[PDB]
């Protein structure tokens, strides 16, 4: 897949079939749901998981003092810089995994259509399956819900591929 | 014919990851709160206002801080205009 | 000033919501508060690597 579609809003993964009856666009709903649960699960660990602290040391000062005031300005600065790096590492690690699982789910759906059409369709190298066989819109939707049967289209498609 | 595609946005935001720095993502959510309501509210915690009185003045019995007698609080707030009018 | 809410976090700039796990409003906190950080924006990717057209 070279590029995505600008106007697909009901899902992240789907198909745009085209046959003699016209061209239609339908969204896959199973792989899109699985990506939402993995994304919403990451937000569940972060949102609403705070810790409470009531009494702390003074973190701002007015009158300059000696050693004790320099120590309190260093303990507070150590905690802030360490937590700032921890926030950077947590977001960057989660963003790395979120993009990777999203791209892997796109390739997993590409394999499922190829696995279902084991002997009736092959890869065209453009993320498409050029099929001239008698496969109407209902036949396309049979692939979508996993109810497509290749036995009734095995002998009907093997001879047509040698012809074309 | 049975092509595959994915959702795209004309104007997405930019997040930071381990490998790249300026990668483009369709939808991103803010994680750092950088805004405030503007006032200190006292519904879960018993908040005691300063009213130009510090804690030490109210402890010793400053006559201008006579309202803070036998009072308890969950968080004392000291104003920046607190002044003492008593013996030094 | 003193107002009314239903919120746990208290900062000298005023009360802030505690739903987000990080904040940079002020380093002085009281109660259930998000941890202080130096960054202003930390975008979390909730979508796909976007390509135009």
């Amino acid at each position, epitope marked *: 897949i070279e590029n995505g579609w600008e*106007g697909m*809003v009901d*899902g992240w993964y789907g198909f745009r079939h085209q046959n003699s009856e016209g061209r239609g*666009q339908a969204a896959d709903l*199973k792989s899109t749901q699985a990506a*939402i649960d993995q994304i919403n699960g990451k937000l569940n660990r972060l949102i609403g998981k705070t810790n409470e602290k009531f009494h702390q040391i003074e973190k701002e000062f007015s009158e300059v003092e000696g050693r004790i005031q320099d120590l309190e300005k260093y303990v507070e600065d150590t905690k802030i810089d360490l937590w700032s790096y921890n926030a950077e590492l947590l977001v960057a690690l989660e963003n790395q995994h979120t993009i990777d699982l999203t791209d892997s789910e796109m390739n997993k759906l590409f394999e499922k259509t190829k696995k279902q059409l084991r002997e009736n369709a092959e890869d065209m190298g453009n993320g498409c399956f050029k099929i001239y066989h008698k496969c109407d819109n209902a036949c396309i939707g049979s692939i979508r819900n996993g109810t497509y049967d290749h036995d009734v289209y095995r002998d009907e498609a093997l001879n047509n591929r040698f012809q074309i | 014919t049975l092509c595959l595609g994915h*959702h795209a946005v*004309p104007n997405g935001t930019i997040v930071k990851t381990i490998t790249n720095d300026q990668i483009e993502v369709t*939808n991103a959510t803010e994680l750092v709160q950088n805004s405030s309501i503007g006032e200190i509210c006292d519904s879960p915690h018993q908040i005691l206002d300063g009213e130009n009185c510090t804690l030490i003045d109210a402890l010793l019995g400053d006559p201008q801080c006579d309202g803070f007698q036998n009072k308890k609080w969950d968080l004392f707030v000291e104003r920046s205009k607190a002044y003492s009018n008593c013996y030094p | 000033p003193i107002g009314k809410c239903n919120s746990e976090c208290i900062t000298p700039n005023g009360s802030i919501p505690n739903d987000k796990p990080f904040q940079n409003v002020n380093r002085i906190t009281y109660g259930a508060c998000p941890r202080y950080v130096k960054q202003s924006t930390l975008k979390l990717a909730t*979508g796909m690597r976007n390509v135009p057209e």
Partner: antibody
Framework: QIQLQQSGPGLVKPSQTLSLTCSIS??????????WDWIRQSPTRGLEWLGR?????????EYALSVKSRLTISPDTSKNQISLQLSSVTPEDTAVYYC?????????????????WGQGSLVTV | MTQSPSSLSASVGDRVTITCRTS??????THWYQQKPGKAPKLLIY???SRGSGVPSRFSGSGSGTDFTLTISSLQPEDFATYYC?????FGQGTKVEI
């Protein structure tokens, strides 16, 4: 405050065209994180989906399987309306039509939930 | 789109569970709708987990596989309406509750 008042006559000749205008006040059609569906309801089959028209840099259209070759939805930006055009009407379509706004989205994806509905009846000879 | 109840007469304050069994197992797309007779419907709970605007706290939903249940904590005389279940583009046949 989102208010949708749809207009249009509710008495048309069978085997003809149909006009239905859904005026929108308080919100604009040019909304990135929103869509505008069209739902009809009958005592016989019930609620069913017809189509939608959102806006990603220009007006896109979608339609149902049954009324794919008879329904055209024409949006307009001039005075904040959305127009429904039904062609070759049938007296089985004696039902009420609802103009409703989608776009209760999570993570930028329109989940197909509908908000801020309207009211409108239709009957043919 | 199948719903186990079609018409019921529950007392005021009763707890009723309406099961909307679907075909495809996905939870973040399905919603719930309530339509009083003579006006437009509204949205109570979306994505089967979070209530919408203008919804009291007595409405709750659950998600378990391909079966989704909408539960009312206490029935009210003002809650006499037909209930509709939508997954992505198909609506249920309806659920008429009565006081």
């Amino acid at each position: 405050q989102i208010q949708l008042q749809q207009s249009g006559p509710g008495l048309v000749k069978p085997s003809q065209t149909l006009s239905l205008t859904c005026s929108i006040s308080g919100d604009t059609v040019t909304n990135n994180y929103a869509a505008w569906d069209w739902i009809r309801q009958s005592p016989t089959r019930g609620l069913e989906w017809l189509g939608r028209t959102f806006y990603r840099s220009k007006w896109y259209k979608e339609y149902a399987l049954s009324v794919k070759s008879r329904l055209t939805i024409s949006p307009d930006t001039s005075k904040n309306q959305i127009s429904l055009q039904l062609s070759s009407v049938t007296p089985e379509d004696t039902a009420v039509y609802y103009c409703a706004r989608a776009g209760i989205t999570i993570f930028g994806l329109i989940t197909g939930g509908l908000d801020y509905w309207g009211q409108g009846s239709l009957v043919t000879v | 789109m199948t719903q186990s109840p079609s018409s019921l007469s529950a007392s005021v304050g009763d707890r009723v569970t309406i099961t909307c069994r679907t075909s495809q197992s996905l939870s973040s797309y399905t919603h719930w709708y309530q339509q009083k007779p003579g006006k437009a419907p509204k949205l109570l709970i979306y994505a089967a987990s979070s209530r919408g605007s203008g919804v009291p706290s007595r409405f709750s939903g659950s998600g378990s596989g391909t079966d989704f249940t909408l539960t009312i904590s206490s029935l009210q005389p003002e809650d006499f309406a037909t209930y509709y279940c939508q997954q992505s583009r198909t609506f249920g046949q309806g659920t008429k509750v009565e006081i």
